[PDB]
Amino acid sequence: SKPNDYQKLFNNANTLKTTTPIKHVVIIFQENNSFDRYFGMYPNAKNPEGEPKFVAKENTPNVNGLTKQLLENNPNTKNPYRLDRNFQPCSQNHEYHQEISSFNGGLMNKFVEHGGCDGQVMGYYDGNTVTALWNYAQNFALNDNTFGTTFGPSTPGALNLVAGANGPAMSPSGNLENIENNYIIDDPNPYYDDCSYGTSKSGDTNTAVAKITDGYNIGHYLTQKGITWGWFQGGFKPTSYSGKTAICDAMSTNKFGVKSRDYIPHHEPFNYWKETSNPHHLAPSDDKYIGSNDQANHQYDISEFWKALDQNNMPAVSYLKAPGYQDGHGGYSNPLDEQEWLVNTINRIQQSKDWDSTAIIIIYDDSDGDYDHVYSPKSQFSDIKGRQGYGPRLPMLVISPYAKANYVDHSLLNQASVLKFIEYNWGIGSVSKYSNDKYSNNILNMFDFNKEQKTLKLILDPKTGLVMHHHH
Amino acid sequence: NSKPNDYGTLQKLFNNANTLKTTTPIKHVVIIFQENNSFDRYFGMYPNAKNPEGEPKFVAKENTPNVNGLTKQLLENNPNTKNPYRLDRNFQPCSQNHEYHQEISSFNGGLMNKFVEHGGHDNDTYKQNCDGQVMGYYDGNTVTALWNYAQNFALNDNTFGTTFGPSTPGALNLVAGANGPAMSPSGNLENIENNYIIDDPNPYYDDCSYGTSKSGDTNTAVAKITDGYNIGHYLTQKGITWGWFQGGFKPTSYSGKTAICDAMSTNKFGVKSRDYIPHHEPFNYWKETSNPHHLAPSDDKYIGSNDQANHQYDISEFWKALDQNNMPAVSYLKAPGYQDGHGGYSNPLDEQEWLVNTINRIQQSKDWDSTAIIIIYDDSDGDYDHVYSPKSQFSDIKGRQGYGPRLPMLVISPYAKANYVDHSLLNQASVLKFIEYNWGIGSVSKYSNDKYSNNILNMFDFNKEQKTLKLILDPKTGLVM
Numbered sequence: 001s002k003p004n005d006y007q008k009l010f011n012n013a014n015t016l017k018t019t020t021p022i023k024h025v026v027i028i029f030q031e032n033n034s035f036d037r038y039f040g041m042y043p044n045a046k047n048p049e050g051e052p053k054f055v056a057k058e059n060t061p062n063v064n065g066l067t068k069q070l071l072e073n074n075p076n077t078k079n080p081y082r083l084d085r086n087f088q089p090c091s092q093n094h095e096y097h098q099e100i101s102s103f104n105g106g107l108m109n110k111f112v113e114h115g116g117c118d119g120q121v122m123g124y125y126d127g128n129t130v131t132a133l134w135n136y137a138q139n140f141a142l143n144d145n146t147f148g149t150t151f152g153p154s155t156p157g158a159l160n161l162v163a164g165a166n167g168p169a170m171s172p173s174g175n176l177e178n179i180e181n182n183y184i185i186d187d188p189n190p191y192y193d194d195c196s197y198g199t200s201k202s203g204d205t206n207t208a209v210a211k212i213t214d215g216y217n218i219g220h221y222l223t224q225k226g227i228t229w230g231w232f233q234g235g236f237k238p239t240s241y242s243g244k245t246a247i248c249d250a251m252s253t254n255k256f257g258v259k260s261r262d263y264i265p266h267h268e269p270f271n272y273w274k275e276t277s278n279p280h281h282l283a284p285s286d287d288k289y290i291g292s293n294d295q296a297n298h299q300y301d302i303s304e305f306w307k308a309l310d311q312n313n314m315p316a317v318s319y320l321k322a323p324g325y326q327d328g329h330g331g332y333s334n335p336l337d338e339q340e341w342l343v344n345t346i347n348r349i350q351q352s353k354d355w356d357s358t359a360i361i362i363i364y365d366d367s368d369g370d371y372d373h374v375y376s377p378k379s380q381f382s383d384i385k386g387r388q389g390y391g392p393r394l395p396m397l398v399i400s401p402y403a404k405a406n407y408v409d410h411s412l413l414n415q416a417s418v419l420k421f422i423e424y425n426w427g428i429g430s431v432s433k434y435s436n437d438k439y440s441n442n443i444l445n446m447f448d449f450n451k452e453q454k455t456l457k458l459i460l461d462p463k464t465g466l467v468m469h470h471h472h
Numbered sequence: 473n474s475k476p477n478d479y480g481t482l483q484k485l486f487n488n489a490n491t492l493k494t495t496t497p498i499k500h501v502v503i504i505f506q507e508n509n510s511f512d513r514y515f516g517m518y519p520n521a522k523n524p525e526g527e528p529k530f531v532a533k534e535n536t537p538n539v540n541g542l543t544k545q546l547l548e549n550n551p552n553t554k555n556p557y558r559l560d561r562n563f564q565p566c567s568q569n570h571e572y573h574q575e576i577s578s579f580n581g582g583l584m585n586k587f588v589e590h591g592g593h594d595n596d597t598y599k600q601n602c603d604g605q606v607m608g609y610y611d612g613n614t615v616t617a618l619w620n621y622a623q624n625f626a627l628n629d630n631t632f633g634t635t636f637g638p639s640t641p642g643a644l645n646l647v648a649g650a651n652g653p654a655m656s657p658s659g660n661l662e663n664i665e666n667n668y669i670i671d672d673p674n675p676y677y678d679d680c681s682y683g684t685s686k687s688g689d690t691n692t693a694v695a696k697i698t699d700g701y702n703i704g705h706y707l708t709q710k711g712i713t714w715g716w717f718q719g720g721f722k723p724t725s726y727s728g729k730t731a732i733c734d735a736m737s738t739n740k741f742g743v744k745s746r747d748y749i750p751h752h753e754p755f756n757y758w759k760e761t762s763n764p765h766h767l768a769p770s771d772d773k774y775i776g777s778n779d780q781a782n783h784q785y786d787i788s789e790f791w792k793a794l795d796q797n798n799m800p801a802v803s804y805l806k807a808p809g810y811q812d813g814h815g816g817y818s819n820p821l822d823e824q825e826w827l828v829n830t831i832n833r834i835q836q837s838k839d840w841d842s843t844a845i846i847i848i849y850d851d852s853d854g855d856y857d858h859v860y861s862p863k864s865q866f867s868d869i870k871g872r873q874g875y876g877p878r879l880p881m882l883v884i885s886p887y888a889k890a891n892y893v894d895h896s897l898l899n900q901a902s903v904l905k906f907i908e909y910n911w912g913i914g915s916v917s918k919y920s921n922d923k924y925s926n927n928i929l930n931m932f933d934f935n936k937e938q939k940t941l942k943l944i945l946d947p948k949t950g951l952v953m
């Protein structure tokens with residue numbers, strides 16, 4: 001119920017030596033959707049009356065999605081079906097062991113049993129609902145062969161994105177059902193975070209906390225090299241303080257009336273290492289120091305990204321995490337609120353003076369446990385207890401003036417491919433002996449650095465996802 | 473095609489491969505291109521063998537990695553109308569249907585559940601002699617050598633045919649990463665779609681394609697590649713020693729200037745077949761890289777270099793080059809038919825004899841220290857494999873659907889990780905990618921999948937202090953000698 005015992009200005013990202021023309025990568029880390037749920041039906045939409053109309057461009061390449069056979073004779077006890085945009089989607093079961101059970105040894109036929117609201121595990125959306133996401137694929141690059149580095153929920157997902165490893169780790173509560181063979185398989189809260197504890201509405205007295213005990217994440221290396229970087233999350237800014245201790249009680253109500261916490265502590269991977277943490281959610285020492293070294297330790301409210309961007313101090317590496325209601329997670333979020341966040345954010349970055357050297361990556365943390373038909377290949381760590389993977393397949397997009405347009409990359413990626421790109425582009429090696437970065441393919445087939453004409457900005461209506469300063 | 477077509481418009485010693493600049497310690501790659509077995513058929517049950525009395529015994533070593541193979545669920549509750557089942561050592565396996573379209577039909581939109589329906593042949597005949605064999609798998613009591621290679625070297629369980637379909641697309645994909653553009657004097661028939669070869673037309677530039685040879689067939693159309701290069705073009709340009717070395721390539725006679733390839737062998741089950749299989753010789757589909765009259769090297773010293781042979785050789789020429797310290801930088805080995813692994817006319821035991829004798833002999837040579845041997849297959853026979861293969865970048869192009877079925881892939885080398893399963897996504901053009909990477913060549917053509925293919929470097933450890941040991945086996949059993 002209470003928190004446990006726990007200035008240097010960087011050169012502008014634009015001046016840094018990089019392997020590619022990309023000077024700024026922005027990773028928009030959304031929640032809880034399988035590849036098939038979002039793109040299985042791409043690029044075919046129902047187009048009923050009164051919903052945003054989607055019509056695919058001629059010669060849209062195909063995705064490894066939901067075929068006639070998968071739609072009509074699914075091995076599961078219920079067939080895939082089209083989810084309504086007007087209803088609030090539930091959250092399915094994304095526990096490590098449950099997801100493996102759904103996969104059922106390759107049969108991929110126990111999702112109703114182990115992903116179960118019931119039956120929504122089989123639901124998919126099309127372009128009438130995930131309109132923006134589908135329009136982004138129509139104009140930029142999509143990968144249909146990207147997987148969670150391990151099976152399991154949101155905390156392994158976040159740790160794998162920034163370290164390519166989900167441990168080694170310890171908890172004061174012991175392993176419980178959170179940790180297996182030193183690797184985090186569920187969602188203990190981060191140790192070094194005031195807002196994990198019962199003093200915050202965003203915290204939980206009965207959620208265990210965990211810390212990483214060996215191996216670095218990417219932040220160690222970006223800080224060391226003087227590369228401007230940050231994790232920017234909705235709700236990170238405390239609503240109040242209670243004697244040194246930060247209180248994160250910010251809440252929003254989603255389109256479907258669900259009020260939820262803005263800040264989700266177990267979605268903040270850098271606060272699992274002591275070195276990369278900002279436990280008191282300290283604001284930047286100044287707007288000028290966003291992305292550099294100071295009391296914030298590279299951990300920020302989402303508001304600070306926009307201050308940096310608008311002040312010509314866009315970081316080299318920015319992770320963007322929506323306020324809860326917009327992160328795309330079932331139950332408390334949904335595709336319409338997510339789309340507003342996605343469209344507003346991506347519109348704003350494209351309008352900025354740094355769009356010309358930017359790559360935006362949309363990737364997910366976990367599948368919610370939702371149906372996807374692909375029996376994921378093994379990772380090099382799959383024989384190690386607590387590191388089973390690869391996990392379920394996820395949406396992955398690259399939005400950039402250097403992105404291939406209306407292009408589907410079939411290259412085998414995992415969450416540590418994002419890590420691989422950062423390492424490749426800024427000249428950093430493998431983060432640790434635990435990391436999957438060493439085995440991950442890069443994302444370069446989603447880019448064309450040789451073409452003369454740039455891929456143009458795509459400005460959309462945040463309320464519909466349909467095609468519609470510099471400063472907002 | 474009873475007689476050879478007209479071939480239309482009618483010497484340089486390369487430096488020793490050991491003197492060449494390379495990216496890695498590998499100065500010699502040997503690609504042993506076997507036939508017609510899916511990953512699951514050969515390795516789905518790895519590393520668990522039945523070990524019935526009298527059959528060559530396999531136990532797995534401590535810490536053998538797991539493969540993406542046949543689980544309890546796939547074994548007991550398979551989506552197909554018949555469950556996977558263990559094939560015996562003791563019978564001549566049939567050949568299943570590895571046609572481009574039939575294989576796609578087995579996959580059945582991702583259900584992977586129509587193999588009995590489409591992996592078989594609708595044939596009297598097949599029904600009475602072969603029923604159910606599409607679902608058969610072997611274990612270490614049959615494919616003993618191959619399982620022991622995996623136990624001592626590197627195996628990849630995520631390697632696929634570049635396209636769906638049979639042997640010719642596989643061979644073209646291996647050497648070019650593309651199965652066209654191509655044309656046949658006979659038109660498409662069921663051989664070509666959208667100028668890509670989807671079945672087995674014989675090579676145009678090969679005397680032994682035609683009815684004059686028992687290896688040939690009057691009623692089989694020929695085809696040629698009309699645009700785009702293969703790796704041979706680049707190796708020759710660059711003066712890198714290379715060859716394709718195949719059993720039965722040496723003609724048994726000449727009728728005027730026409731080579732006759734009538735060599736035959738009898739397998740262990742009494743099945744007699746042609747040693748030479750023209751539609752397995754990919755370089756003869758390009759005029760530029762062909763040796764249509766099967767001319768011999770000008771001299772042993774010229775094996776791998778430029779002369780009348782144009783880098784196309786009888787298997788016998790490989791051993792000569794090896795024994796005389798002129799091992800090529802790049803060598804493709806193709807067994808005489810009876811030992812190529814293909815159902816119907818070959819089998820695991822004849823194949824195993826070929827593999828063991830070949831690999832023993834390379835390991836015993838002076839250049840093993842700088843060699844990597846790759847074992848990879850051309851096609852799956854249409855045999856069961858559970859993996860719904862991911863798409864290639866050419867999958868929306870008619871005649872180029874892929875990736876096709878998953879195949880066995882091994883790397884045997886003093887530099888190979890030992891008892892290691894690489895899960896990297898490979899396809900047949902990954903072999904091409906390795907050659908290009910190692911010897912400093914770019915993509916072969918705008919048509920090639922090489923540019924989208926991962927390399928095989930996760931199967932090597934060039935940094936470890938102790939070299940991977942030789943594995944000398946008994947060709948009769950595949951057991952350690």
Ligand code: VO4
Pocket residue numbers: 031032091094153154155187329366368
């Ligand atoms: O681990 V989560 O329920 O925040 O997708």
Ligand code: VO4
Pocket residue numbers: 507508570638639640672751814851853
């Ligand atoms: O297409 V082949 O039957 O020579 O494996």
